[PDB]
Subunit: 478 residues, 2 copies
């Protein structure tokens, strides 16, 4: 269809893989913060500006869909305004401006260059190549109008800290726009578009090779540098709930507003392209909070902790959501897709839990067989007894302990044809209801109530696969 649905895992495998290479190394101490400073400078001062120049002095202004651009822009503007007004309504009287200035930019700014660009390249490289122009246009523009407004709010906060002298045009907007203009993500865009208009939208040959060499060495480098900045960063209940608010105000609220704005504004004659743009905007906002919002908050020396914790968390939760949502949008055949996502989730998590690998460690080995059962079933009772291990884990989370789990009634059930659950009839489902029965008398068990009772009561199967074949995901975190 209009989405490279298969490259989802491979594209996320590359982005969530290079960044991982820098987390274990960052954890290994092989490259400390001082060592990481050189890579950060290389990716910020040379690698990224060269990429911006190369993609700006050649980007076409003739065939673009500006309607999609304004739709996304007003979606993020509305999210900005909502976040600002509710943050102003409830806050400490001496800190309203700080929150109203940092929170909404932290929800309207996403790292779409480092992580978003490879993902959108893998999804659109042969179907609709024009989408790269939109991803390269919308980000700087969104960094040009909203950023200054949020910066103006932080300067009002500073005016609260120091009365100054009513610098309405001296400090309120003197540095509010200066900070935006003195960033390589903005002024280099101006230089690139100026050279685009000066020439015939072409880069000189003598410098084309230099620009290509200094530009293609940024994606993996940026992912690695992000990896070294995602170590030792996650550190109150109020902080937790506001964090859940900001996270559900970034990868949850922004998506729906974007799709509504696109569907209400864009008037494409071919409805397929209209739906493609709508879902494209839907995956907009899900991109983790841009580390650019993190360097801002560190420079202003604000609360910091919420954003940096949000910086790490936003990325982690974007991994599953970006995956399932891409499948749900293209979902409305689907039965084989249900076991397809289960296979990819299992194999990579199988690597994960083995690295993580008495009662608790019994779950890991029991879970691995469920993951191990995925591939052997994937190529093909011998390969179906994985449910016995899976049924064991259904209560083992809630539990002489080991022998009771080993002596589960599942082997009796095993003694007693499209997918693993519906293979030899329905008599396995009622046994899972006994596991549901034992479940009702830990987060995995609430899945059991809904993942093993839907027949007696496709999107149901989509969350029925991540419940069990992806259960090893928790092992990495614990």
């Amino acid at each position: 269809p209009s989405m490279s649905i298969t490259r989802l895992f491979p594209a996320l495998l590359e982005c969530f893989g290079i960044v991982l290479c820098g987390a274990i190394a960052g954890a290994a101490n092989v490259i400390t913060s001082t060592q990481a400073k050189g890579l950060g400078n290389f990716v910020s001062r040379f690698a990224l500006p060269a990429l911006l120049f190369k993609n700006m002095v050649v980007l076409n202004f003739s065939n673009v869909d500006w309607s999609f651009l304004y739709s996304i822009l007003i979606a993020k503007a509305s999210v900005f305004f909502i976040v600002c007004v509710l943050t102003l309504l409830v806050a400490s009287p001496d800190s309203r401006f700080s929150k109203a200035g940092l929170f909404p930019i932290f929800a309207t700014q996403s790292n779409d260059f480092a992580l978003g660009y490879p993902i959108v390249e893998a999804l659109y490289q042969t179907t609709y190549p024009e989408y790269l122009q939109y991803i390269y246009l919308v980000a700087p523009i969104s960094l040009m109008m909203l950023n200054p407004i949020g910066f103006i709010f932080c300067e009002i906060q500073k005016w609260k800290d120091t009365q100054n002298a009513s610098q309405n045009k001296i400090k309120i907007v003197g540095l509010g726009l200066l900070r935006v203009l003195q960033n390589p993500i903005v002024f280099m865009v101006f230089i690139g578009i100026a050279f685009n208009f000066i020439l015939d939208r072409k880069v000189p040959v003598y410098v084309e090779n230099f620009l290509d060499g200094l530009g293609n060495s940024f994606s993996g480098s940026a992912l690695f540098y992000l990896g070294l900045t995602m170590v030792g960063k996650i550190k109150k209940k109020s902080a937790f709930v506001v964090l859940i608010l900001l996270i559900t105000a970034k990868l949850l609220v922004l998506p729906l507003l974007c799709r509504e704005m696109v569907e209400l504004l864009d008037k494409g004659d071919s409805v397929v392209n209209h739906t493609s743009l709508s879902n494209y905007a839907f995956l907009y906002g899900v991109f983790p909070v841009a580390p650019g919002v993190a360097i801002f908050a560190t420079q202003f020396n604000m609360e910091v902790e919420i954003i940096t914790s949000g910086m790490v968390i936003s990325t982690f939760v974007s991994a599953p959501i970006m995956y399932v949502s891409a499948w749900l949008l293209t979902f409305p055949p689907l039965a084989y897709a249900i076991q397809n996502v289960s296979f990819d989730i299992s194999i990579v998590s199988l690597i994960s839990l083995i690295w993580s690998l008495m009662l608790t460690t019994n779950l890991l080995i029991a879970q691995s067989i469920v993951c191990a059962g995925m591939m052997i079933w994937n190529f093909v009772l011998v390969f179906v007894l994985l449910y016995s291990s899976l049924y064991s884990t259904y209560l083992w989370t809630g539990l002489i302990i080991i022998i009771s789990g080993w002596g589960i009634p599942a082997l009796l059930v095993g003694v007693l044809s499209i997918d693993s659950a519906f293979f030899y009839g329905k008599e396995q489902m009622i046994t899972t209801a006994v596991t549901l029965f034992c479940s009702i008398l830990i987060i995995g068990l609430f899945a059991n109530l809904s993942s093993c009772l839907w027949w007696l009561f496709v999107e149901l199967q989509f969350f029925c696969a991540v419940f069990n074949f992806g259960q090893g995901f928790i092992s990495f975190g614990i």
Copy 2:
């Protein structure tokens, strides 16, 4: 022909430009040693290892020219043996082994991955794609035979500092080879090449591509930050020059000879192509590998690191001119073409470098700028009036005399700039050669044979760099 001659400078501007960025940054106190160290642990621990696994687990063993491989190998071995025995013959009695282990590996190893691979890609991307297999095979093999012998001398020299015939002599002499990502990862790559059907799994292909393509520019940059504050005796200078003519001068001749008397290709055009390709092998500057070796062993180092920096600088002109000389035997235009490339870039550095000495720089800039108006078209030929001025301004009221130079009279008095309005300019250039016979001074030596060869194509190739490339000294002074 068999060479992408036009793509040298775009590649040379790439490889020199990217490393230049790291060099000026390392010279800007913006990215210090510690910062560069992280870039070094991300260019050799993942970026370089990942590249090896991608280009080894897919590289074919069915269609390769092994004859070219052995010929280069025995050429590099012969150079190894020659310099080793010479260093052994003449040296301090307590230090013969150290040089005999360090100077020949330093003269047989070269950074073929960081600076050689982009160049060979630019010259062979649509003509001879097999070339990359040879650039990817010969280097690891050469790091597996000669280097162990080097470490043997390194352990022979350590045998002087402190009967470990198979306890140290070869216990660590091969250990250092097998414990390098440039060797053992090759073994892993070939093992997976034979385990699979010479294919990389799809689920890891994107990861390997992402971690591999981010290594060329990164390695060039890293080298850029390792080339700052590194250039620091007369004996040291002369042995350095001996190593410079050992690495980029003698070894290329040995390679071209080995290849022409070993390879028996039916199509002699391919035979000549590989001969110059082997000749190019060795013109590459020494690898950072020899530098990190000598630093770890804690030997003299100075010569290796200064040779490291110098080798690359001298590899820029040699590589470019050599690329043109091999394909030279039309050429007259080629002469003004190369004169153009040198003039435009030289002027750029000249400006950044830009009273009597700076009078040369502005006068020189007119010759380069004049080479551009001349490359675009007496008005554009009076660039030679500044050039005749710089012919004695090097040997020079003084600026007043250089302004009142008789060239204005000559200008008052049709293929290329020198032979444009006849030969009466050459008789005046003879006068500039007459005032020369009556560093920058060395430029006059070119005038001695470059302004009177007609009175007396390679001459034109060396008569263009002397003037249109005169700025070269400005950057160095």
